[PDB]
Write a protein that binds this ligand. Structure first.
Ligand SMILES: *[C@@H]1O[C@H](CO)[C@@H](O[C@@H]2O[C@H](CO)[C@@H](O[C@@H]3O[C@H](CO[C@H]4O[C@H](CO)[C@@H](O)[C@H](O[C@H]5O[C@H](CO)[C@@H](O)[C@H](O)[C@@H]5O[C@H]5O[C@H](CO)[C@@H](O)[C@H](O)[C@@H]5O)[C@@H]4O)[C@@H](O)[C@H](O[C@H]4O[C@H](CO)[C@@H](O)[C@H](O)[C@@H]4O[C@H]4O[C@H](CO)[C@@H](O)[C@H](O)[C@@H]4O)[C@@H]3O)[C@H](O)[C@H]2NC(C)=O)[C@H](O)[C@H]1NC(C)=O
Ligand SMILES: Cc1cc(OCc2ccncn2)c(C(C)(C)C)cc1Cl
Ligand SMILES: [Ca+2]
Ligand SMILES: [Ca+2]
Ligand SMILES: [Cl-]
Ligand code: NA
Ligand code: NA
Ligand SMILES: [Zn+2]
Length: 805
């Protein structure tokens, strides 16, 4: 109940929400059915429209008008945005040359430059180039300020997950808004785009920017705009708040536009009908900038022009139907569209089985346009698993397609020609970023980055300390003229041991054998030096990774590779090696096929054993430094050490062997040498974070050898590929992956074929940031380079996407 018979007199778009059943006058009252009786009349004026004309100049103030052209309007803060232009001979902001804003030029009483976030729904990255002719204000912001060619949204590439990620710096799995539709089994409650439940605060986790600001003494304008409030009024309201007295005036504001998304759904991303919505958005930007210029704020305010996701061509005929795969279609609930989420229709039905649902959806048709996953097997770069609102069964839908349960769902619901929601690496889903103002750089292009990074920057822009989030603070310092955040490297927590030769061969009873008894002062001093770390500067190019948790581990040096060997997990945490352009690939000699050698630097009690692999009929083993890339027949023996061995399903060895035998050398050829760091990852609770030992759910049968859920590699070279990886003077280039360690290759539908037809495609799908691997391992890489730390942070957030231009 609301007693809607109070009044909005003097209260229009009040910043503090009043408690029911007192009537509300805030920009949210419309959404709650709670506005005072006179809200429309007082707060949503429209008389005479939105622009001054010649005949209105210096008019007598009429309080009925939408905006004003009277002499007193500047001091009242309520002129039409074009008042100075029409009535005072001023130029529009877009017609002024751009001039570097070296320092904030703010009216007296402003303690800090305000921030205005101008967010646009469905604004695909390529609109910046393709619509440039019809967006002169946006193009001026873009060319004069700081911009990226595109900004990567989060998955799923839907509106609320992305806007709330912008507000919090969190992955959807952590902020809780994991889709546009949700069921929370703990609450036993559902969240929908339509309706009231979406306004309940228990859906919205983390700490959004307006709360961060308020808690730290910075006032905030409202972020949510009720749909029926026209754009012109949103702008005028922001401008009015900006004329408040110093103690009442917010420092952070948001505008939101439902366009171009709204039209994009109806006409497709490049429909001829799309030109008009882009013109209209640009005109709105023009109104804001003219309005700031009138208030002498146009060289004071930082403006961020940012999208939530792009838009792809998607029509009704490109719909796959679960009814063409499943007999039990009525025993399942599907969240449909550009992604699929499946759960049982009834928790009372114990005959429901996810295993057989997945199998029935796996590689069943030759051109199948979706791929089923258990959520923990989704590419780790999506960070889409650790939330009870994300169903165990997930369908990754191909770009341009939909998934639906039954045909009737689609024609009893062609309407649409566009949609979004797909994998956040897809080009059509990419969106925009422009920063313009005293705190941003002048005429600067920056590399593409992920929207999870912006919360930290918005906090820096406002002098706020960010709540804990998934950004990497400092990685976007290169966007900023000032207010940078000067992070330090995390402290190493565990220092390594450097074991020498401490064990005789006969002390080991591991059930391993090797044909290696084949017997020189020249080359005995030589081998000693290699074991003491003489080639270490060649194979460990950026310093050893720091171990950021408490553990027991040994550094092991070898001619061709260096490793950090965990006495707790019985295998390396990391193995580092450099492969120059000239390096030669060789084979595993016949007499060494099953060779595994005790490492006399490491106790039997802290070693793996061969008997466990023999006894474990599902589990085989592989090596982290590949024997194929040994520098000499003699160095090859090092690669067969029990300390270089890791557990691998035979199905996974097909992947790994092709990566090590073919792909590493290909990359070294193309990139002029690579440095490779590889290792295991344990993430049994799919939280994106390193497992402790007591979280490991699987061991090699009969042993304490833990089975990794994934294997990583980080592959680094010189960005200037005229320089070899091991002699690089400037910026680095990186690509990484986190491959799932799976006992089958069901994910790859062409796996019966030669590895050359499917392996590299799988690795591309599981591309990762170095930062993703840092979370998963508790390691910190690139500790010793000649580069600035902020530059290294940017490198650690890089994602190699393998999309075209
Ligand atoms: C991305 O960035 C984010 C932010 O930094 C990272 O997420 C953090 O990770 C931490 C580790 O997982 C986690 O710390 C835990 O916090 C527990 C208290 O949490 C509450 O309070 C915070 C602070 O205000 C709040 O933010 C939390 O909000 C979550 O939950 C509510 C609903 O409950 C949601 O609305 C909200 O969206 C959010 O949900 C998300 O997080 C939870 C986990 O907290 C997930 O379950 C959800 O799926 C969702 O993703 C909370 O309200 C604290 O209790 C934990 O402490 C336990 O574990 C420690 C280990 O040190 C142990 O020492 C303690 O004893 C304790 O164990 C006891 O409880 C166990 C579990 O019940 C039990 O088994 C034991 O036996 C003990 O009894 C823990 O410290 C932190 O909360 C989240 N923060 C957020 C915002 O998500 C994230 O990791 C980053 N991602 C990547 C890839 O890097
Ligand atoms: C810039 C911005 C705008 C936002 O909301 C704008 C909006 C969206 C849908 N309907 C009405 N208004 C949000 C919400 C989290 C969604 C509050 C966050 C940000 Cl960062
Ligand atoms: Ca949207
Ligand atoms: Ca984990
Ligand atoms: Cl969804
Ligand atoms: Na075996
Ligand atoms: Na397969
Ligand atoms: Zn949309």
């Amino acid at each position: 109940w609301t007693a809607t018979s109070g009044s909005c007199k003097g209260r229009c778009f009040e910043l503090q929400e009043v408690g029911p059943p007192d009537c509300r006058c805030d920009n949210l009252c419309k959404s709650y059915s709670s506005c005072c009786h006179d809200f429309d009349e007082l707060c949503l004026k429209t008389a005479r429209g939105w622009e001054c004309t010649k005949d209105r100049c210096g008019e007598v103030r009429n309080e009925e008008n939408a905006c004003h052209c009277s002499e007193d309007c500047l001091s009242r803060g309520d002129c039409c945005t074009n008042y100075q232009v029409v009535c005072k001979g001023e130029s529009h902001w877009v017609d002024d040359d751009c001039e570097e804003i070296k320092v904030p030029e703010c009216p007296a009483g402003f303690v800090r430059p305000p921030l205005i976030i101008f967010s646009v729904d469905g604004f695909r990255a390529s609109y910046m180039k393709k619509g440039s002719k019809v967006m002169p204000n946006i193009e001026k912001l873009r060319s004069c300020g700081t911009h990226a060619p595109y900004m990567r949204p989060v998955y799923p590439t839907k509106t609320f997950p992305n806007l709330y990620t912008l507000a919090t710096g969190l992955y959807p799995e952590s902020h809780g808004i994991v889709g546009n539709s949700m069921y929370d089994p703990v609450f036993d409650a559902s969240f929908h785009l339509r309706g009231r439940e979406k306004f309940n605060h228990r859906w919205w986790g983390g700490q959004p920017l307006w709360i961060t600001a308020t808690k730290q003494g910075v006032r905030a304008g409202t972020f949510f705009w009720s749909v029926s409030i026209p754009h012109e009024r949103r702008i005028l309201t922001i401008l009015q708040w900006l004329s408040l007295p110093d103690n009442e005036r917010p420092s952070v504001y948001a505008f939101y536009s439902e366009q171009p998304d709204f039209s994009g759904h109806k006409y497709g991303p490049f429909g001829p009908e799309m030109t008009n919505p882009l013109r209209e958005i640009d005109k709105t930007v023009g109104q804001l900038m003219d309005g700031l210029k009138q208030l002498r704020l146009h060289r004071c305010v930082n403006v961020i022009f940012v999208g939530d996701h792009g838009m792809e061509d998607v029509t009704c005929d490109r719909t796959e139907f679960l009814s063409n795969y499943l007999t039990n279609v009525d025993d399942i609930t599907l969240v449909p569209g550009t992604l699929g989420r499946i759960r049982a229709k009834s928790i009372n039905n114990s005959k429901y089985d996810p295993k057989t649902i997945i199998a029935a959806l796996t590689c069943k048709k030759p051109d199948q346009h979706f791929k089923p996953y258990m959520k923990q097997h989704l590419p780790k770069r999506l960070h889409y698993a650790n939330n009870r609102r994300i169903e165990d069964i997930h369908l990754l839908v191909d770009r341009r397609w939909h998934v639906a349960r039954k045909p009737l769902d689609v024609y009893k619901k062609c309407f649409f020609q566009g949609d979004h929601g797909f994998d956040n690496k897809v080009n059509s889903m990419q969106t925009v970023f422009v920063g313009y103002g005293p705190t941003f750089k002048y005429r600067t292009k920056v590399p593409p980055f992920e929207n999870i990074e912006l919360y930290n920057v918005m906090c820096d822009l406002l002098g706020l300390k960010p709540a804990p989030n998934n950004g990497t603070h400092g990685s976007l310092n290169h966007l900023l003229r000032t207010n940078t955040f000067r992070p330090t490297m995390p402290d190493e927590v565990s220092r390594p041991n450097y074991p020498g030769i401490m064990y005789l061969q006969s002390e080991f009873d591991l059930g391993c054998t090797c044909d290696d008894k084949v017997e020189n002062k020249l080359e005995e001093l030589n081998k000693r030096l290699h074991t003491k770390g003489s080639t270490k500067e060649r194979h460990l190019l950026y310093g050893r990774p720091a171990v950021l948790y408490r553990t027991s581990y040994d550094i092991l040096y070898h001619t061709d590779f260096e490793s950090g060997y965990s006495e707790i997990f019985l295998m390396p945490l990391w193995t580092s090696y450099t492969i120059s352009k000239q390096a030669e690939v060789s084979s595993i000699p016949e007499h060494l096929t099953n060779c595994v050698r005790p490492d006399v630097r490491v106790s039997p009690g802290f070693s793996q054993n061969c008997l466990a692999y023999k006894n474990d009929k599902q589990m085989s083993y592989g090596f982290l430094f590949p024997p194929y890339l040994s520098s000499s027949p003699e160095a090859k023996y090092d690669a067969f050490l029990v300390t270089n061995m890791v557990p691998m399903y035979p199905a996974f060895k097909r992947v790994w062997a092709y990566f090590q035998r073919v792909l590493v050398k290909k990359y070294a050829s193309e990139r002029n040498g690579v440095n490779v760091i590889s290792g295991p990852i344990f993430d049994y609770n799919y939280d994106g974070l390193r497992d402790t030992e007591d979280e490991i759910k699987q061991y090699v049968e009969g042993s304490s050898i833990p089975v990794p859920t994934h294997y990583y590699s980080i592959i680094t070279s010189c960005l200037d590929f005229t320089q070899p990886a091991d002699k690089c003077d400037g910026p680095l280039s990186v690509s990484s992956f986190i491959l799932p360690h799976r006992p089958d290759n069901d994910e790859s539908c062409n796996s019966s074929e030669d590895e050359s037809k499917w392996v590299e495609e799988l690795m591309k799908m599981h591309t990762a940031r170095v930062r993703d691997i840092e979370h998963l391992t508790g390691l910190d890489f690139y500790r010793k380079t000649s580069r600035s730390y902020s530059e290294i942070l940017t490198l650690k957030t890089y994602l190699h996407t393998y999309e075209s231009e």
